[PDB]
Coordinates of C-alpha atoms and ligand atoms in Angstrom, one line a residue:
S59 CA 146.5 22.9 -99.4
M60 CA 146.1 18.9 -101.3
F61 CA 144.5 17.5 -98.3
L62 CA 141.8 19.4 -96.0
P63 CA 140.6 16.6 -93.4
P64 CA 137.0 16.6 -93.0
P65 CA 135.7 17.5 -89.6
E66 CA 135.4 14.6 -87.2
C67 CA 132.2 12.5 -86.9
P68 CA 131.2 11.7 -83.5
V69 CA 132.2 10.2 -81.0
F70 CA 130.3 8.5 -78.1
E71 CA 131.6 7.0 -74.6
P72 CA 128.5 5.3 -73.3
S73 CA 127.8 4.5 -69.3
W74 CA 127.7 0.9 -68.8
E75 CA 124.0 1.4 -68.4
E76 CA 123.9 2.8 -71.6
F77 CA 125.9 0.3 -73.2
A78 CA 123.6 -2.6 -71.6
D79 CA 121.5 -1.8 -74.9
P80 CA 122.5 -1.4 -77.8
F81 CA 119.2 -0.9 -79.8
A82 CA 118.6 1.7 -76.9
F83 CA 122.0 3.1 -77.4
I84 CA 121.5 3.5 -81.1
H85 CA 118.0 4.8 -80.8
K86 CA 119.5 7.2 -78.1
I87 CA 122.5 8.9 -80.5
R88 CA 120.3 8.4 -83.5
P89 CA 119.3 12.3 -84.0
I90 CA 123.0 13.5 -83.6
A91 CA 124.7 10.5 -85.5
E92 CA 121.8 10.3 -88.5
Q93 CA 123.4 14.0 -89.5
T94 CA 127.0 13.0 -89.8
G95 CA 126.0 9.5 -91.2
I96 CA 128.7 7.3 -89.3
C97 CA 129.7 7.7 -85.6
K98 CA 132.3 6.0 -83.6
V99 CA 131.5 4.3 -80.1
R100 CA 133.8 3.3 -77.3
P101 CA 132.6 0.8 -75.4
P102 CA 133.3 0.9 -71.3
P103 CA 136.8 0.9 -70.3
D104 CA 136.4 -2.5 -69.3
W105 CA 134.3 -4.2 -72.2
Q106 CA 137.2 -6.3 -73.6
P107 CA 135.8 -9.5 -75.6
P108 CA 138.9 -11.9 -75.6
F109 CA 140.4 -12.1 -78.9
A110 CA 141.9 -15.7 -79.6
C111 CA 142.9 -17.5 -83.3
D112 CA 145.9 -19.0 -84.3
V113 CA 147.6 -16.7 -86.9
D114 CA 148.6 -20.0 -88.9
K115 CA 145.9 -22.0 -88.9
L116 CA 143.1 -19.2 -90.5
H117 CA 143.7 -19.3 -94.3
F118 CA 141.9 -16.6 -96.7
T119 CA 142.6 -15.5 -99.9
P120 CA 142.8 -11.4 -100.8
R121 CA 141.6 -9.4 -103.2
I122 CA 143.9 -7.3 -104.9
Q123 CA 143.4 -3.4 -105.1
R124 CA 145.0 -1.0 -107.5
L125 CA 144.4 2.5 -105.7
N126 CA 143.3 5.0 -108.2
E127 CA 140.6 7.4 -107.8
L128 CA 137.4 7.4 -109.9
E129 CA 138.4 3.6 -111.4
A130 CA 135.5 1.1 -110.9
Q131 CA 136.1 -1.7 -108.5
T132 CA 133.3 -4.5 -108.4
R133 CA 132.2 -4.4 -104.8
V134 CA 132.7 -8.0 -103.8
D135 CA 146.3 -17.7 -100.6
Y136 CA 147.6 -16.4 -97.2
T137 CA 147.9 -17.3 -93.0
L138 CA 146.7 -14.2 -91.1
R139 CA 150.9 -14.6 -90.1
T140 CA 151.5 -14.4 -93.6
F141 CA 149.4 -11.4 -94.3
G142 CA 150.6 -9.6 -91.4
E143 CA 154.3 -10.3 -92.6
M144 CA 153.4 -9.0 -95.8
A145 CA 151.6 -6.1 -94.8
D146 CA 154.0 -4.5 -92.3
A147 CA 156.6 -5.1 -94.8
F148 CA 154.5 -3.0 -97.2
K149 CA 154.2 -0.3 -94.9
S150 CA 157.8 -0.4 -93.2
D151 CA 159.4 -0.3 -97.0
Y152 CA 156.8 2.2 -98.2
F153 CA 157.4 5.0 -95.4
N154 CA 160.9 3.7 -94.7
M155 CA 160.1 3.7 -91.1
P156 CA 158.7 1.2 -88.4
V157 CA 155.1 0.9 -88.7
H158 CA 154.0 2.7 -85.5
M159 CA 156.3 5.6 -86.2
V160 CA 154.1 6.2 -89.0
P161 CA 151.5 9.2 -88.5
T162 CA 147.6 8.5 -89.2
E163 CA 147.8 12.3 -90.5
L164 CA 150.7 11.2 -93.4
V165 CA 149.1 7.8 -94.3
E166 CA 145.8 10.0 -95.0
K167 CA 147.5 12.3 -96.8
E168 CA 149.6 10.0 -98.8
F169 CA 146.6 7.7 -99.8
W170 CA 144.8 10.5 -101.2
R171 CA 148.1 11.7 -103.1
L172 CA 148.6 8.2 -104.3
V173 CA 145.3 7.5 -105.2
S174 CA 144.9 10.8 -107.7
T175 CA 148.3 10.4 -109.0
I176 CA 148.5 8.8 -112.4
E177 CA 152.1 8.0 -112.3
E178 CA 152.0 5.7 -109.1
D179 CA 150.3 2.4 -109.7
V180 CA 150.2 0.7 -106.0
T181 CA 148.1 -2.6 -105.7
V182 CA 147.2 -3.5 -102.1
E183 CA 145.7 -6.8 -100.7
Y184 CA 143.1 -7.4 -98.2
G185 CA 140.7 -10.3 -97.1
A186 CA 137.0 -9.9 -96.8
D187 CA 134.7 -12.6 -96.1
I188 CA 132.1 -14.2 -94.1
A189 CA 132.0 -15.7 -90.7
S190 CA 132.5 -19.9 -91.5
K191 CA 134.4 -22.7 -90.3
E192 CA 137.4 -22.1 -92.4
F193 CA 137.5 -18.6 -90.7
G194 CA 134.9 -17.8 -87.6
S195 CA 134.0 -14.3 -86.0
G196 CA 136.1 -12.4 -84.0
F197 CA 134.1 -12.5 -81.2
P198 CA 133.0 -15.7 -78.9
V199 CA 131.0 -18.0 -80.1
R200 CA 129.3 -21.2 -78.2
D201 CA 130.8 -24.2 -79.3
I202 CA 133.8 -25.8 -77.9
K203 CA 134.6 -25.5 -74.2
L204 CA 134.6 -21.7 -73.4
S205 CA 136.4 -19.9 -70.7
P206 CA 134.2 -17.6 -68.2
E207 CA 135.6 -14.6 -70.0
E208 CA 134.7 -15.7 -73.4
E209 CA 131.0 -16.5 -71.9
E210 CA 130.5 -12.9 -70.5
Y211 CA 130.3 -12.2 -73.7
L212 CA 128.6 -14.5 -75.6
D213 CA 125.3 -13.0 -75.1
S214 CA 126.6 -9.6 -75.2
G215 CA 123.9 -7.5 -78.2
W216 CA 127.8 -5.9 -79.2
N217 CA 129.1 -9.1 -79.8
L218 CA 128.4 -9.0 -84.1
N219 CA 127.3 -12.6 -83.8
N220 CA 124.2 -11.8 -81.8
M221 CA 123.4 -8.5 -83.2
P222 CA 121.2 -9.9 -86.2
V223 CA 119.2 -12.0 -84.1
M224 CA 118.5 -9.9 -81.6
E225 CA 114.9 -8.8 -80.9
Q226 CA 114.6 -5.3 -81.4
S227 CA 116.1 -6.2 -85.1
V228 CA 113.9 -6.5 -87.9
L229 CA 116.5 -8.8 -90.0
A230 CA 116.2 -11.3 -87.4
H231 CA 112.6 -13.0 -88.6
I232 CA 113.6 -13.4 -92.0
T233 CA 113.4 -17.1 -93.3
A234 CA 114.6 -16.7 -96.7
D235 CA 118.5 -16.8 -96.9
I236 CA 120.1 -13.4 -96.7
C237 CA 123.5 -15.0 -95.4
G238 CA 125.9 -12.4 -97.3
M239 CA 123.9 -9.5 -94.9
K240 CA 122.7 -11.3 -91.7
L241 CA 126.2 -12.7 -91.3
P242 CA 129.6 -10.9 -90.3
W243 CA 131.7 -10.1 -92.3
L244 CA 135.7 -10.2 -91.3
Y245 CA 138.1 -7.8 -93.1
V246 CA 141.8 -8.1 -92.4
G247 CA 143.4 -4.8 -93.6
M248 CA 146.5 -3.2 -95.0
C249 CA 147.9 0.2 -95.1
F250 CA 146.1 1.6 -97.9
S251 CA 143.6 -1.1 -98.5
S252 CA 140.2 0.6 -99.1
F253 CA 136.6 0.7 -99.1
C254 CA 135.0 2.4 -101.9
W255 CA 132.3 4.7 -101.3
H256 CA 128.8 2.7 -100.8
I257 CA 126.1 2.4 -98.7
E258 CA 124.2 -0.6 -97.3
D259 CA 121.9 -3.4 -99.3
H260 CA 118.4 -2.0 -98.6
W261 CA 119.6 1.1 -96.6
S262 CA 120.0 -1.0 -93.8
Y263 CA 122.6 0.2 -90.7
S264 CA 126.0 -1.4 -90.4
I265 CA 128.4 -1.8 -87.5
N266 CA 132.0 -2.7 -87.6
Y267 CA 134.4 -3.7 -84.6
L268 CA 137.9 -3.2 -84.8
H269 CA 139.7 -6.2 -83.0
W270 CA 143.0 -5.2 -83.7
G271 CA 145.6 -3.5 -85.0
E272 CA 146.3 -0.2 -86.7
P273 CA 143.5 2.3 -87.4
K274 CA 140.8 2.5 -90.0
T275 CA 140.2 5.9 -91.3
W276 CA 136.6 6.4 -92.4
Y277 CA 134.3 8.9 -94.2
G278 CA 131.1 9.3 -94.2
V279 CA 128.3 11.4 -95.8
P280 CA 124.9 11.5 -93.6
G281 CA 121.7 9.8 -95.3
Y282 CA 119.9 13.3 -96.3
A283 CA 122.8 13.9 -98.6
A284 CA 123.1 10.6 -100.4
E285 CA 121.6 11.7 -103.8
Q286 CA 123.8 15.0 -103.7
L287 CA 126.7 12.5 -103.3
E288 CA 125.0 10.2 -106.3
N289 CA 124.6 13.1 -108.3
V290 CA 128.6 14.8 -108.0
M291 CA 129.5 10.9 -108.5
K292 CA 127.7 10.3 -111.8
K293 CA 128.9 13.7 -113.3
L294 CA 132.5 12.2 -112.5
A295 CA 131.9 9.1 -113.6
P296 CA 129.5 8.0 -115.4
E297 CA 130.7 4.7 -115.6
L298 CA 129.5 3.5 -112.5
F299 CA 125.7 4.2 -112.7
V300 CA 125.5 2.0 -115.6
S301 CA 122.8 -0.9 -115.0
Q302 CA 124.0 -3.6 -113.7
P303 CA 123.3 -7.4 -114.6
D304 CA 122.9 -8.4 -111.2
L305 CA 124.2 -7.9 -107.3
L306 CA 127.6 -9.1 -108.2
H307 CA 127.9 -6.1 -110.0
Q308 CA 127.6 -3.2 -108.1
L309 CA 130.5 -0.9 -109.2
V310 CA 132.0 1.2 -106.5
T311 CA 135.1 3.6 -106.4
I312 CA 137.7 5.3 -104.8
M313 CA 136.5 9.9 -104.1
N314 CA 138.3 12.0 -102.9
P315 CA 136.2 13.5 -99.9
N316 CA 137.3 17.0 -100.6
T317 CA 135.7 16.5 -103.7
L318 CA 132.8 16.2 -102.5
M319 CA 133.1 18.9 -99.9
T320 CA 134.0 21.5 -102.8
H321 CA 130.4 20.3 -104.1
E322 CA 128.9 21.2 -100.7
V323 CA 128.2 17.5 -99.9
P324 CA 129.0 17.2 -96.0
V325 CA 131.5 14.8 -95.2
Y326 CA 132.7 13.5 -91.7
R327 CA 135.7 11.4 -90.7
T328 CA 137.2 9.5 -88.1
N329 CA 140.2 6.7 -87.2
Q330 CA 138.7 3.7 -85.7
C331 CA 141.0 2.2 -83.7
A332 CA 141.1 -1.5 -82.0
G333 CA 138.1 -1.9 -79.5
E334 CA 136.0 0.7 -80.8
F335 CA 132.5 0.5 -82.6
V336 CA 131.9 2.4 -85.9
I337 CA 128.1 2.5 -87.1
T338 CA 126.8 3.4 -90.1
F339 CA 123.4 4.9 -90.5
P340 CA 120.4 4.1 -93.4
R341 CA 121.9 5.3 -96.6
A342 CA 124.4 6.8 -95.3
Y343 CA 127.3 6.9 -97.8
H344 CA 130.8 5.9 -96.7
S345 CA 134.1 4.9 -97.8
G346 CA 137.8 4.6 -96.0
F347 CA 141.2 3.0 -95.9
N348 CA 143.3 1.0 -93.3
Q349 CA 146.3 2.4 -91.9
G350 CA 147.9 -0.9 -91.7
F351 CA 147.6 -4.4 -90.9
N352 CA 144.4 -5.1 -88.8
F353 CA 141.3 -7.3 -88.4
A354 CA 137.5 -6.1 -88.2
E355 CA 134.2 -7.4 -88.0
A356 CA 131.4 -6.1 -89.6
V357 CA 127.7 -7.1 -89.6
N358 CA 124.6 -5.5 -91.1
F359 CA 121.1 -4.6 -89.1
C360 CA 118.1 -3.1 -89.4
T361 CA 115.7 -1.4 -86.7
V362 CA 112.0 -0.6 -86.3
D363 CA 113.5 2.9 -86.8
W364 CA 114.5 1.5 -90.5
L365 CA 111.6 -0.2 -91.6
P366 CA 110.1 2.8 -93.5
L367 CA 113.3 3.2 -95.2
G368 CA 113.3 0.0 -96.4
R369 CA 110.4 0.2 -97.9
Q370 CA 111.2 2.9 -99.5
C371 CA 114.8 1.7 -100.1
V372 CA 112.8 -1.3 -102.3
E373 CA 110.6 1.3 -104.3
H374 CA 114.0 3.1 -105.0
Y375 CA 115.6 -0.2 -106.6
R376 CA 112.1 -0.6 -108.7
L377 CA 113.2 2.8 -110.0
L378 CA 116.8 1.4 -110.7
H379 CA 115.8 -2.1 -111.9
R380 CA 118.5 -2.9 -109.2
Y381 CA 117.8 -6.7 -107.8
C382 CA 116.5 -7.1 -104.1
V383 CA 118.3 -8.7 -101.6
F384 CA 115.2 -9.9 -99.8
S385 CA 111.5 -9.2 -100.2
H386 CA 110.5 -6.3 -97.9
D387 CA 107.0 -7.0 -97.8
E388 CA 107.6 -11.1 -97.5
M389 CA 109.4 -9.8 -94.2
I390 CA 106.5 -7.7 -93.0
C391 CA 104.2 -10.2 -93.6
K392 CA 106.6 -12.9 -92.0
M393 CA 106.9 -10.9 -89.0
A394 CA 102.7 -10.1 -88.8
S395 CA 102.5 -14.0 -89.1
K396 CA 104.6 -14.2 -85.9
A397 CA 102.6 -11.0 -84.1
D398 CA 102.3 -13.0 -81.1
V399 CA 105.5 -13.4 -80.0
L400 CA 106.8 -10.0 -81.4
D401 CA 108.5 -7.4 -79.0
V402 CA 105.5 -5.0 -78.4
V403 CA 107.0 -1.7 -80.0
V404 CA 107.9 -3.8 -83.4
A405 CA 104.5 -4.8 -83.6
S406 CA 103.3 -1.5 -83.2
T407 CA 105.7 -0.8 -85.9
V408 CA 105.5 -3.4 -88.6
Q409 CA 101.6 -2.6 -88.2
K410 CA 102.3 0.8 -89.7
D411 CA 104.4 -0.4 -92.4
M412 CA 102.0 -3.2 -93.0
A413 CA 99.5 -0.3 -93.5
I414 CA 100.5 1.2 -96.0
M415 CA 101.7 -1.9 -97.6
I416 CA 97.9 -2.7 -98.1
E417 CA 96.9 0.4 -98.8
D418 CA 99.5 0.4 -102.2
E419 CA 98.6 -3.3 -103.0
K420 CA 94.6 -2.6 -103.0
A421 CA 95.6 0.5 -105.6
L422 CA 98.1 -1.7 -107.4
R423 CA 95.1 -4.2 -107.9
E424 CA 92.5 -2.1 -108.6
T425 CA 94.8 -0.3 -111.5
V426 CA 95.3 -3.6 -113.0
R427 CA 91.4 -5.0 -113.1
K428 CA 91.1 -1.6 -115.0
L429 CA 93.5 -2.8 -117.5
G430 CA 91.3 -6.1 -118.2
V431 CA 93.3 -8.4 -115.9
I432 CA 90.5 -10.5 -114.4
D433 CA 91.4 -14.2 -113.9
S434 CA 93.4 -14.8 -110.7
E435 CA 95.0 -17.7 -108.7
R436 CA 96.7 -17.3 -105.1
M437 CA 100.4 -18.4 -105.2
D438 CA 103.1 -18.7 -102.5
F439 CA 105.5 -16.6 -103.6
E440 CA 108.2 -17.8 -100.9
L441 CA 108.2 -21.0 -102.1
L442 CA 110.2 -19.7 -105.2
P443 CA 113.5 -19.2 -106.0
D444 CA 114.1 -15.4 -106.2
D445 CA 115.3 -15.5 -109.8
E446 CA 112.2 -17.0 -110.6
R447 CA 110.0 -14.2 -109.1
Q448 CA 111.7 -11.2 -110.3
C449 CA 109.6 -8.5 -112.3
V450 CA 110.9 -9.0 -116.4
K451 CA 111.0 -4.8 -115.9
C452 CA 112.3 -3.6 -112.9
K453 CA 113.7 -6.7 -111.1
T454 CA 112.1 -6.5 -107.8
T455 CA 111.0 -9.4 -106.1
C456 CA 107.9 -10.4 -106.1
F457 CA 105.8 -11.1 -103.0
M458 CA 102.1 -9.3 -102.6
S459 CA 101.4 -10.1 -106.0
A460 CA 102.6 -10.4 -110.0
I461 CA 100.9 -10.6 -113.6
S462 CA 101.7 -13.7 -115.3
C463 CA 100.8 -15.1 -118.6
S464 CA 100.6 -18.8 -119.9
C465 CA 102.4 -17.1 -123.2
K466 CA 105.2 -16.6 -121.6
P467 CA 105.7 -19.8 -118.4
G468 CA 107.5 -18.6 -115.5
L469 CA 107.9 -15.4 -116.4
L470 CA 106.8 -12.2 -113.9
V471 CA 105.8 -8.4 -113.5
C472 CA 105.1 -6.8 -110.3
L473 CA 101.8 -4.8 -110.7
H474 CA 103.8 -1.8 -112.1
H475 CA 104.8 -3.3 -115.1
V476 CA 101.3 -5.2 -116.6
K477 CA 102.4 -3.9 -119.7
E478 CA 105.3 -5.1 -119.9
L479 CA 105.2 -9.1 -119.8
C480 CA 103.9 -9.5 -123.5
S481 CA 101.8 -8.7 -126.0
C482 CA 99.2 -10.7 -125.5
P483 CA 95.7 -8.7 -124.1
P484 CA 95.5 -8.6 -120.9
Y485 CA 92.7 -10.9 -120.5
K486 CA 95.0 -13.9 -120.9
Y487 CA 96.7 -12.8 -118.1
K488 CA 96.5 -14.3 -114.5
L489 CA 97.0 -12.0 -111.2
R490 CA 99.3 -14.4 -109.0
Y491 CA 98.6 -13.0 -105.4
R492 CA 100.0 -14.3 -102.1
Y493 CA 96.6 -12.7 -100.1
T494 CA 93.3 -11.8 -100.4
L495 CA 92.8 -8.3 -99.3
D496 CA 90.4 -10.2 -96.7
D497 CA 93.4 -12.1 -95.4
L498 CA 95.6 -9.3 -94.7
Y499 CA 93.5 -7.2 -92.5
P500 CA 93.5 -9.8 -89.9
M501 CA 97.1 -10.0 -90.1
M502 CA 97.3 -6.7 -89.7
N503 CA 95.5 -6.9 -86.4
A504 CA 97.0 -9.5 -84.8
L505 CA 99.9 -7.1 -84.9
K506 CA 97.3 -4.4 -83.2
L507 CA 96.2 -6.7 -80.7
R508 CA 99.8 -7.4 -79.7
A509 CA 100.8 -4.0 -79.6
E510 CA 97.7 -3.2 -77.6
Ligands
S2G126 O1 136.5 -2.5 -93.1 C1 135.7 -2.4 -94.6 O2 136.6 -2.8 -95.5 C2 134.7 -2.1 -95.1 C3 133.5 -1.6 -93.7 C4 132.1 -2.0 -94.4 O3 132.0 -0.7 -95.3 C5 131.2 -1.6 -93.3 O4 130.0 -1.3 -93.3 O5 131.7 -2.0 -91.7
CL127 CL1 147.1 6.2 -108.4
MN128 MN1 130.1 -0.7 -95.5
ZN129 ZN1 108.5 -4.4 -111.8
ZN130 ZN1 101.5 -13.5 -123.0

């Protein structure tokens, strides 16, 4: 009746030994956790990264949030103290109770009541920003003079600053600017502040640590059910599914998990408490809301497990005409070009993706030659700003190749949209390519040698 909580997602309590290597652990829980999309990880009892910051010197500008189910929201001044004061007073007055007296079950039930009730117009506020000098990681980082406890945690795989640039990770090697994606984000929550249903850019993993404060309630959907969810959502809120002019205009919304569950989309929940991690798996839809004043930190990452999905995702983006954050092929080639220093399991996995890339590229080039594109010239795509190498048609970031015509200087189409560049006959076109097929096979061989 009214709200029936989804079943609980998996909770893991790894031993210190399991905990020692986050990517090993994540790979271990994956068979379980990918069936639920999200999972919760409680570190060993004594893993306690020290949090320390001055609540008066940390400033941020909060996002205002209206709480209306199915209403469109776009995906992307207080001190921490003054936000906290506002946040505690709001929750306190909302329930006419002390903050720790309010049951999580009640806040949840009430959240889903208020977002579906037209007459209620509750607005809340929240902080979401990347780690910067004005607002840094809640984890220890090298710079100033650090206490021995902070140095214990400096190099932790679970220190979310390290997670991106570890070597079982794939996003580390990217030389392109993807700041929004490899740098941790800080989230300052208050009661009912929420994050709308979404999946990560390029279907990456995400990992979220709640440093302190009241819990964060999560809903997650396994990756296999992503399209199922999107279909449900498209029916109830087609506005969200219109073409978006860029990445800064992605539309997202609050939606009751019971709605999803009614439509046979599997949904799981959890209350993430302070000191606990939540991990989201590739293409796993998730949303939730904060129970009260709190402070979280999250970052995207990509394992070798993810590489084929990363390629599928970019294909999926092309079909949708969605902008890419980075070129997946450029990342693959960058890694190939560093085959000798790559981890060996990484090298082996990159090699397999590269082989598909090359075979696809071979077929695409044969096709455009048969269309009468004859002229060609090598081109260092990675030197162009992203906005100068997006396919006119499908907006994909070009790297392996593109078609240009002197008729339209600067414009490019990918080899899927040769027909979409201009009205000139194909013999006026140039195939611009990063590598000849003959360049590519030795790059792949280097990987094979490294993998042995
Ligand atoms: O905590 C928020 O406000 C959003 C969390 C984000 O979706 C994540 O992947 O950690
Ligand atoms: Cl409402
Ligand atoms: Mn997320
Ligand atoms: Zn295209
Ligand atoms: Zn032309």
